[PDB]
């Protein structure tokens, strides 16, 4: 399906300790044309890393939805002793970067369109019995101004910490579930309505609440205590009360009282209609 001979480098994208992503062109006709694809390869093919990568490939093979990253195939390099994953290329990259770079193209109607699409992708993942764990705007990708897709870059395996998206029972008991994905979705909705403004990100806000001085595990201890006793990210400037209410309801310490993704999609779509 994808012969290393015809996979031509175009551009270096992300890199981390676990994997790296490149833009490539697949040119089987050798005519300097072909489809542009995004290619992931492993930095170090240990037994565990290759097992993880193979599981990533099997997960992606099973997922087909308009708001989930689109799998294309695999390609073997180094005389078939290395493995690379081929995906559909999305020009605008992460939603976190798109929001910072293209504020001129974004208003509240647009934010709610993206919110709806994220909810629908999460509904789909639940039907596959898949728990995402890593929902955050850094892991949502932008195809164009009208279409976002959930992914999970996973190139590395306080400002950089994923803990600021995690539900309290994930922090205290390592319990990840659909309901903790709903908690993290609430943080995504917060991120959207901050426009990724500097100083207002979840890590920056939580660190201001706990004390910017704190380091190491002390951050975790204070974050758990804060969340367990109703400490929450504040309402973003300009964000409607009804949208903050959705965030608040996702951030319920009572796991079973969080809304479902089907509930959230219906609510967001009904609101979107009314502002449109
Ligand atoms: C604990 C670690 N676990 C391992 C297993 N994992 C499972 C998982 C793995 C993913 N893998 C991706 O999402 C992925 C993988 C590889 C690539 C190349 C891409 C990708 C695709 C399109 C694309 N367009 C661009 N454009 C740009 O960079 C523009 C210049 C800015 C970059 N890319 N990069 C996405 C998605 C899901 C999910 F969410 F779908 F269920 C789940 C989870 C973690």
**Domains located in the chain, CATH noted:** 4-88 (3.30.200.20), 95-275 (1.10.510.10)
How far lies 198's CA from each of 93, 99, 166, 203, 204, in Å? 19, 12, 21, 11, 8
Give dist(CA 45, CA 82) in Å, integer: 8
How far lies 217's CA from each of 157, 205, 222, 223, in Å? 19, 18, 9, 10
C-beta 145 within 6 A of ligand 1: no
C-beta 85 within 6 A of ligand 1: yes
Give dist(CA 99, CA 188) in Å, integer: 12
Distance between start and end Cα atoms, the chain: 44
What is the distance in A from the centroid of ligand 1 to the CA of 190? 22
Q: Are 183 and 134 in contact (CB under 8 A)?
A: no
Q: Are 67 and 118 in contact (CB under 8 A)?
A: yes
In the beta sheet, which residues pair with residue 88?
37
**Nearest ligand 1 atom to alpha carbon 150:** 39
C-beta 40 within 6 A of ligand 1: yes
C-beta 90 within 6 A of ligand 1: yes
Give dist(CA 46, CA 205) in Å, integer: 38
Angle at 203 between CA 117 and CA 191, to 5 degrees: 25
CA 47 to chain centre: 26
What is the distance in A from the centroid of ligand 1 to the CA of 262? 24
Output the residue whose Cα is nearest ligand 1's atom 30.
93
Strands 82-88 and 35-42, how do they pair? antiparallel
262: its two tokens: 């089907």
In the beta sheet, which residues pair with residue 19?
42
Give dist(CA 242, CA 244) in Å, integer: 6
How far lies 148's CA from each of 10, 73, 115, 204, in Å? 23, 21, 9, 25
Resolution value in angstroms = 1.5
Q: Exactly one of 31, 97, 134, 213 is catalytic; which is it?
A: 134
Query: Can you say whether residue 60 is alpha, beta or left, with left for phi > 0 and alpha for psi between -120 and 50 degrees?
Result: alpha
**Nearest ligand 1 atom to alpha carbon 55:** 5
Q: How many residues does the chain have?
A: 276
Give dist(CA 186, CA 139) in Å, integer: 15
- Burial environment of residue 275 by CB neighbours within 10 A (0 to 12, 13 to 18, 19 or more): exposed
**What technique determined this structure?**
X-ray
Give dist(CA 81, CA 89) in Å, integer: 25
**Nearest ligand 1 atom to alpha carbon 38:** 18
In the beta sheet, which residues pair with residue 203?
none
What is the distance in A from the centroid of ligand 1 to the CA of 241? 33
Instruction: Give the list of residues 6+ apart from residue 190 with CB closer than 8 angstroms, or none.
Output: 202, 233, 236, 247
Instruction: Give the list of residues 6+ apart from residue 95 with CB closer than 8 angstroms, or none.
Output: 114, 137, 138, 140, 141, 142, 148, 192
Three-state DSSP class for residue 230: coil
Three-state DSSP class for residue 71: strand
- Residues making up the annotated binding site are 13-21, 40
- Residues making up the annotated binding site for ATP are 13-21, 40
C-beta 267 within 6 A of ligand 1: no
Instruction: Give the list of residues 6+ apart from residue 215 with CB closer than 8 angstroms, or none.
Output: 158
In the beta sheet, which residues pair with residue 39?
22, 86
For residue 134, indicate whether it is catalytic: yes
**Nearest ligand 1 atom to alpha carbon 40:** 18
C-beta 209 within 6 A of ligand 1: no
C-beta 68 within 6 A of ligand 1: yes
Three-state DSSP class for residue 167: coil
């Amino acid at each position: 399906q994808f012969e290393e001979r015809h996979l031509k480098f175009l551009q270096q994208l992300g890199k981390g300790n676990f994997g790296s992503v490149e833009m490539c062109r697949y040119d089987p006709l050798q005519d300097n044309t072909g489809e542009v694809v995004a290619v992931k390869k492993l930095q170090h093919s240990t037994e565990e890393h290759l097992r993880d990568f193979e599981r990533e490939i099997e997960i992606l093979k099973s997922l087909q939805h308009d708001n989930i990253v689109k799998y294309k195939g695999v390609c073997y390099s180094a005389g078939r002793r290395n493995l690379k994953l081929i995906m559909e290329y999305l020009p605008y990259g992460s939603l976190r970067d798109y929001l910072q770079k293209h504020k001129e193209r974004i208003d509240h109607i647009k934010l709610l369109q993206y919110t709806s699409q994220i909810c629908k992708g999460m509904e789909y993942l639940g039907t596959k019995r898949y728990i995402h764990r890593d929902l955050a705007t850094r892991n949502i990708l932008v195809e164009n101004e009208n279409r976002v897709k959930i992914g999970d870059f996973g190139l590395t395996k306080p400002g950089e910490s994923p803990i600021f998206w995690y539900a309290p029972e994930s922090l205290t008991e390592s319990k990840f579930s659909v309901a903790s994905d709903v908690w993290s979705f609430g943080v995504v909705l917060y991120e959207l309505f901050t426009y990724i403004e500097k100083s207002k990100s979840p890590p920056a806000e939580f660190m201001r609440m706990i004390g910017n001085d704190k380091q190491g595990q002390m951050i975790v201890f204070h974050l758990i205590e804060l969340l367990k006793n109703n400490g929450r990210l504040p309402r973003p400037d300009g964000c409607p009360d009804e949208i903050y209410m959705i965030m608040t309801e996702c951030w319920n310490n009572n796991v079973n009282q969080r809304p479902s993704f089907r509930d959230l999609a219906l609510r967001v779509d009904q609101i979107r209609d009314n502002m449109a």
